[PDB]
Amino acid sequence: SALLKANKDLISAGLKEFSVLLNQQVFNDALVSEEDMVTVVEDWMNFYINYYRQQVTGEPQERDKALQELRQELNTLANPFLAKYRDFLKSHELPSHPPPSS
């Protein structure tokens, strides 16, 4: 295999859609439970991984490779979303995160 456009198309498509999912949040007025948003993020990732896992007709190498890239891709795309939300909700009313604190 090495790298077929089909794999890149599926991965990029999943990565793009994911980015739109994470960005489509309402980062403006921090309200609502954090665990709720966070649970939603994890819930989506699991749903995506589970679905993508069954969307692979390649050998265990192709499947594992695409599976590892999918998981790592979600962590990298989810990382900014979860870190941005955290700092965002933890920023308003108290800048708890930067040097000026302890």
Swiss-Prot record:
Domain of life: Eukaryota
Keyword Ubl conjugation annotated: no
GO-annotated cellular components: cytoplasm; hemoglobin complex
Region forming the signal peptide: none
Induction trigger: By GATA1 during erythroid maturation.
Gene3D superfamilies: AHSP
Pfam families given in the database record: AHSP (PF09236)
GO biological process annotation, one example: hemoglobin metabolic process
InterPro entries named among the record's database cross-references: A_Hb_stabilising_prot, AHSP_sf
Reported tissue expression: Expressed in blood and bone marrow.
Alphabetical keyword list: Chaperone, Cytoplasm
Keyword Cytoplasm: yes
Principal location: cytoplasm
Function: Acts as a chaperone to prevent the harmful aggregation of alpha-hemoglobin during normal erythroid cell development. Specifically protects free alpha-hemoglobin from precipitation. It is predicted to modulate pathological states of alpha-hemoglobin excess such as beta-thalassemia.
Subunit comment: Monomer. Forms a heterodimer with free alpha-hemoglobin. Does not bind beta-hemoglobin nor alpha(2)beta(2) hemoglobin A.
Family of the protein in this entry: Belongs to the AHSP family.
Designated name of the protein: Alpha-hemoglobin-stabilizing protein
Organism: Homo sapiens (Human)
